[PDB]
Symmetry: C2
Subunit: 305 residues, 2 copies
């Protein structure tokens, strides 16, 4: 038993991380087949980030302006193309460690593992959630740009995030591997506002189910509630509205614990109105919303890849 | 910026995880060079775990009683030896993915990454701490035995933990890679008591420094305390006594934040006596003690391997 914030094994991604230097700046790139993906602001100087014309900048760059370095071997750039906010650098070598992969654009509330890299070298791996305002609360230092988020299903690496910038508030913003930003953010150094961050209600419920599975049951009660009356209370406390789709994915957890979803809702309602009163659930004093219902099912069953 | 419970890249360990089956039970093994390490209770049936005579049991087993399977290829067992509580199965093939490694016995309070595996297949990676009572609060399901903990320094994998059993209380116990148990535990299914679990004071202080680095400064105050008067308060709240050695390793963090260690101590003293009063530090409402002073320095500087 037990319950931990768990990340996917990162071995398959480690083999794809390369170092990209264009002119004076250096960040990480994702090397898949014979293409290197990286944030396009690699072609910027510090002065350019305020109001960059990425087209005009990229035009003055030539293929030999990009220094891709994989560990110690160096790749030859023979092509460069800009797809939205990512640069695609066609190289002369296919990565012999390219896993079965695909690019996916996740939805807010979903979780994924991040592999933090610096100079194309992996530093650490952690699990996070795409917030409802399309930011992430990660751990990034200068030169961590290029770091990617990912999920592993069986044997297929689904790349879903590439890190681009830190906002003045300390939160992080990036794109899918097609170069489209999550959220209304742009890649220039200007004051950018993220929306109100709400709590991922469906994930909290899944976490409460994990707690019941692991023996933490003090929060339960034999009241029930209505989906309607519960959402009224969720709104007041900045909680994402819960829908029938959210109830359905919770079905398997409800079946395993004998506790209907609406019963658990009535329990969560109490916790928001009355709080924890100094107690804990799964070692935490706050309500945790970075475990999806699938994450909980995975950890409590023993799924491998 | 930001701060996350971070684990080491697990790629180098993934390549060493094999499946071990002796008779009817199956668990994970660590394949390094031409040797497979696994918990020795693999040679037990469910009835044997109550009072096993591991010598007499192992004697009735022959080399071909052990089915080692790496992914899909199968290894040939040509030798078996028991070193304390781990089995060493000499095989006919050297792992071509053996990293630079070494076996280390860590001290209580140190952190390490765990790679949870099932059937020799990696499932997830998470960071934990060896508690002062020599247990760990992990995430293990039946068949997770054989899973190993590890640290990575530059290019050398230091293996420090192998998982053996779950205790009736839900905590976990295991050995070093030489087969010596952390703590007073044995590998039989009998009620075993772990000592009083105390809080890793030195780690809390390092975490408080991380918070100051990330902008959380509300807990600070310009009082100071004595090492003596502070330990009096630590004992009352089940906190590990702080020593001059603990102050020294905190030197680098003190230098980076301008806050002397004893000043931070006076801040922590207040938090224990008065609590958080509903606030948070680095997104947490509790005091976190699973970041060593080195972990904090690593994450806030950008060290790679």
């Amino acid at each position: 038993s037990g319950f931990r914030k768990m990340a996917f094994p990162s071995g398959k991604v480690e083999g794809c991380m390369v170092q990209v230097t264009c002119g004076t700046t250096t960040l990480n790139g994702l090397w898949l087949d014979d293409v290197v993906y990286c944030p396009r602001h690699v072609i910027c100087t510090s002065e350019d980030m305020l109001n960059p014309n990425y087209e005009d900048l990229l035009i003055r760059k030539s293929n030999h302006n990009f220094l891709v370095q994989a560990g110690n071997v160096q790749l030859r750039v023979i092509g460069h193309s800009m797809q939205n906010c990512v640069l695609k650098l066609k190289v002369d070598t296919a990565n012999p460690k390219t896993p079965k992969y695909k690019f996916v654009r996740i939805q807010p509330g979903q979780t994924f593992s991040v592999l933090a890299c610096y100079n194309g070298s992996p530093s650490g791996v952690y699990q996070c959630a795409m917030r409802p305002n399309f930011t992430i609360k990660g751990s990034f230092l200068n030169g961590s740009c290029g770091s990617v988020g990912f999920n592993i299903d069986y044997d297929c690496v689904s790349f879903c995030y590439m890190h681009h910038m830190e906002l003045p508030t300390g939160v992080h913003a990036g794109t899918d591997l097609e170069g489209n930003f999550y959220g209304p953010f742009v890649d220039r150094q200007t004051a950018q506002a993220a929306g109100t961050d709400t709590t991922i209600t469906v994930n909290v419920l899944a976490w409460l189910y994990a707690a019941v599975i692991n023996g933490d049951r003090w929060f339960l009660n034999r009241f029930t509630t209505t989906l309607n009356d519960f959402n009224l209370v969720a709104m007041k406390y900045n909680y994402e509205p819960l829908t029938q789709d959210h109830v359905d994915i919770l079905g398997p957890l409800s079946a395993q614990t004998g506790i209907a979803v609406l019963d658990m809702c009535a329990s969560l309602k109490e916790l928001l109105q009355n709080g924890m009163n100094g107690r804990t659930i799964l070692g935490s004093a706050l309500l945790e919303d970075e475990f999806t219902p699938f994450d909980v099912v995975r950890q409590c069953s023993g799924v491998t890849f």
